[PDB]
TrEMBL record, chain B:
Subcellular locations according to the entry: Cytoplasm, Cytoskeleton, Cilium axoneme
Name listed for the protein in its UniProt record: Uncharacterized protein
Whole-protein residues included: 415 to 453 of 465
Signal sequence interval, chain numbering: none
Amino acid sequence: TTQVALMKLYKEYADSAFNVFRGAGVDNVAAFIGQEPDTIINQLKAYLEATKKQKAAEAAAAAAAEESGEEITADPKPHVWRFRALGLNFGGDSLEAIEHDLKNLFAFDGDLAPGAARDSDTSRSSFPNGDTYFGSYADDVKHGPGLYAFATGAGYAGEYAGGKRHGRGVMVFPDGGTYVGEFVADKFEGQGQYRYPDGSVYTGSWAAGQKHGPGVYWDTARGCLRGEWKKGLLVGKGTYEQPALRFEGEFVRGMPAGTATYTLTGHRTLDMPCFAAQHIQAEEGPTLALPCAYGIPPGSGDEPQLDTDKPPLPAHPKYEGLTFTAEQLPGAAPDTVFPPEEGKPVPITAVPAFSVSTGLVA
Amino acid sequence: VYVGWGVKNAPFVPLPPPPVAQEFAWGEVETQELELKPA
């Protein structure tokens, strides 16, 4: 043995994986990830807000310092010095002969054993770009419950394995969206609920960071869209339901096409007198079904982006290439109530209901 | 003068179902401590 490392006088910022945890007031990390997901999400959102505020304040201070006076020449972040009294023996020839361990002893604050992989269960880990980790290690990587801050505002709390995300977890992204569900590697997998920043919510299946499998989307127009989505887009028979109407048909590459079917009921004249007396006491409501069909440009959507002599898909504001065809009479389909009963729990706040007996409630 | 139903004689396309939003990018990847030097 040639060297003994017998101190570490480190410095800790007031926003890391060891201060989101402390504000919670729980006992340990397994009790931090074990809370109800709403409070986890709220705490991570508060951390994101703190990071954004700190960045804005730093930028303003830097601009003011440039305007007059001299440079800042000091760390503006809030920092509190801490001291680990660790003592370890390393055997080598010079300081550069143990570099791994030394730089390991730089950042991982757990149970250091010279020449051995990390196995701490309450370890902290800094990182080059500035993002921090709190949780358990095993076989030199992260494994088990953890809290993890990205230093850009984002944040994760949940299970780790193989050095990456695995199992159940909760994440908050810098834009404002959030995710609650299962994870494989660094991307979504299995079942989960994603909430977008605009207000929409998707509660369904995921494969490798994209929507895949049975899916139920609840957009900002308070309409329910159900289908079997594939690689981030909806393919096959899909259903869109709105308080008065229900459209079902094939989608290709996220846009309607092929033989479809509209079914909707006159809600405008449910209280007006009927034109025929026999409609007064009948049980069949005023609902009609049209066997229509959409149309797409003959090159668009037929190629799965094999990267062109292909027309572009119609966009949102104005759809350029969509056609539409109805050449048969309506067929008087039965009644439709708006809440589809598939995806019955409504994540969105303001969703009005409908029925033949009672019109739009809200 | 205009006398008739207020309907235009143009091809009519029923508006297709509304667009789905997109997730975040993947500039959020877990920075990892570099693994042990194997012997």
